[PDB]
Structure formats: C-alpha cells, structure tokens
Design a protein around this ligand. Structure first.
Ligand SMILES: *CCC(=O)Nc1cc(Nc2ncc(C(=O)OC(C)C)c(-c3cn(C)c4ccccc34)n2)c(OC)cc1N(C)CCN(C)C
Length: 309
C-alpha cells in the first residue's frame, strides 16, 4: 500500500495563547486561541484540545491516533489539523470553526435557516465524506454534532476519534467493545460491529434528518438497547415536516438493510447538488425567501488556517 507521507507539525507552546475555554467533558478541554508562528507576522485563530488535566496512557494513545488521521486529510470539507504540542499533556491544535458545531447551530437559528443552506450543507457533508472514502477512510461517527461551521456557507467534518483506515485489501472493519452512538449507526454495525463506507452513508442519512428537523434527537425516548429490533421490524425515522418526498426518499435509501443498496457519497453529491439548484421545490419552509444569516478583536494580521499553507 501507499506510504503515508503526511507531515506532523510540532508546535512550540509559546507560539499560541489560549484566549477562552470553549468546552469540557470526557475528551478534555477545548479552548479557542491564536497561533502566531515565529517572525511570520500572521495570527491564526485555532482550537486547542488538551487532555482534561491528566495523563492516561490509554488517552494519550487516542489523541495521537486522532492527530494521525487529521494529518492525513486535506480537503475543504474536512477539518484541518495544524499540529500537536508536546507539553505536560499532548495538545491537539486545529483551525477554529467560529460558528461551532452544526447541531447547535440549527437548534439556535431554526427561524433563520433557509432551504438553500440546508441543501448546501448536505452537498458539503457529502463532499467531505466522499473525500474520506477516496482516502480509504471510514469515519464511524458522522452526526450533526461532528460537523463544524466555519461560516454559515461553509461546513467541515470533524471528530476522527473513531476513524479507521481501511487496507487496500480490507472491505469492512470489525470493531471491539467500545461505547458507540447507537441511533446513528447501521444495522450491521449494531449486530456484527461491521463498519464500511456504506455504514457511514447510513449515519449520513441520520445527519440529514437532524438538519431537516432543526436538531431533533433521533428516536427521542426509545432507549438505546432496543433500536436493533426496531430497525429489523422495518421502522425508520419519520418524514420531517419540511421535507418533500423527494428529499425523504434519499434519507430512506440511506437506511436500506442491504448496504450495497444504499447511495454512494458521490451520488448524494449529485442529488443534493441538483436540489440546491431549486431549493423551494424540495424543502418547504415558511418564510424561506426572507431569511439571512451572518471580525473578532485585537489586531488585523489575522489569517484563517485555509489561507496558511
Ligand atoms: C457543538 C459544540 C461546539 O462545537 N461549540 C462551539 C464550538 C466552537 N468552535 C470550535 N472550533 C474548532 C473545534 C475543533 O476542531 O476543536 C478541535 C478538537 C481542537 C471545536 C471543538 C471541537 N470539539 C470536540 C469541541 C467540543 C466543545 C467545544 C468546542 C469543540 N470548536 C466555538 O468557537 C467559537 C464555539 C462553540 N460554542 C461556544 C458552543 C456552542 N454554544 C453557543 C451553544
């Protein structure tokens, strides 16, 4: 197989400054900050994840795994890793996505989100995923929470916590134990712990559903442990109010039991692409026409990661 010649950049801790906390939990702490490479007269808005405060050899292993994947991907619809910093704790440094995750975004902006935006996100997520598929990579955790918003017009896939690189000989991926997001995964993933690109397509379907319902919890109520039987019955997520049958049919096709029957990311690009040419024909949102969506501080040597190569 092809040698992976990605560069892993190591960053001095003096080169960046953590300006405010963004979040906290099982993963650690994510800060927003600025990265100023030395003598370069450029200032790059970044997100920085350090591991809580601890050093668990089974956790350091996991952030370094994530670094590995992120360093191996270069695409406008996939999040960019800027580098790692090897201090007390291993720090992951990425491009700041100022509008946060897309689940939270649609929740907060339902009244302002038009069909053009929804369909575009669909194209963009599909484009990222298709790229990942080209790079033989299975994401395994696609959800609206794991898509970040750089601008309302521009989203990127994140969270390579669970991503696995398939061998040129490998067709699926057998996983082990592990906590998993049940409501987003294909039937095979629940029954056999098989994961393919086509299992990601299923997750893509659920992600589209999240967007179209402005951020509903899939199978709200239904406890995790009985989802497998529900799906084998033939039951699926309901048609969201705003969705034409044309759109809902794409979601449904992502949720076929036979994985080869599901759409390919490349196809999804085409389909949504066509729909985003005439959005009002495909999504019915009241007040669609009169809907608009949206500089920080300090100095003006500021350059987005996308323009720092
Ligand atoms: C959905 C929650 C969220 O993401 N909230 C959020 C996010 C961000 N921006 C941002 N930019 C980059 C990254 C990122 O790639 O971080 C890597 C891991 C270094 C993240 C981010 C990634 N994870 C896993 C997070 C968990 C929690 C918080 C952030 C991240 N996030 C901003 O930047 C302005 C704000 C933001 N807000 C404050 C939370 C949403 N509330 C408004 C509801």
């Amino acid at each position: 197989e092809a040698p992976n010649q990605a560069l892993l950049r190591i960053l001095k801790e003096t080169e960046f400054k953590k300006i405010k906390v963004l979040g906290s939990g099982a993963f650690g702490t994510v800060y927003k900050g600025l990265w100023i490479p030395e003598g370069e007269k450029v200032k790059i808005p970044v997100a920085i994840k350090e591991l809580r405060e601890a050093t668990s050899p089974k956790a350091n292993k996991e952030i370094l795994d994530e670094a590995y994947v992120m360093a191996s991907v270069d695409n406008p619809h996939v999040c960019r890793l800027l580098g790692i910093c090897l201090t007390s704790t291993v720090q992951l440094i990425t491009q700041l996505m100022p509008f946060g995750c897309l689940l939270d975004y649609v929740r907060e902006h339902k009244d302002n989100i038009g069909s053009q935006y929804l369909l575009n996100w669909c194209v963009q997520i599909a484009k990222g995923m298709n790229y990942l598929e080209d790079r033989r990579l299975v994401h395994r955790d696609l959800a609206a929470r794991n898509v970040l918003v750089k601008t309302p017009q521009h989203v990127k896939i994140t969270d390579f916590g669970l991503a696995k690189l398939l061998g040129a000989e490998e067709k699926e991926y057998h996983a082990e134990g592990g906590k998993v997001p049940i409501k987003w995964m294909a039937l095979e993933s629940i029954l056999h712990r098989i994961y393919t690109h086509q299992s990601d397509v299923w997750s893509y379907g659920v992600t589209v559903w999240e967007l179209m319902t402005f951020g509903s919890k899939p199978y709200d109520g239904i406890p995790a442990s009985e989802i497998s039987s529900i799906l084998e019955k033939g039951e699926r997520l309901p048609q969201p109010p705003i969705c034409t049958i044309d759109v809902y049919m794409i979601m449904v096709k992502c949720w076929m039991i036979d994985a080869d029957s599901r759409p390919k990311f490349r196809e999804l690009i085409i389909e949504f692409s066509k729909m985003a040419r005439d959005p009002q024909r495909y999504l019915v949102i009241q007040g669609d026409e009169r809907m608009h969506l949206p500089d920080e501080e300090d100095m003006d040597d500021v350059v987005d990661a996308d323009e720092y190569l």
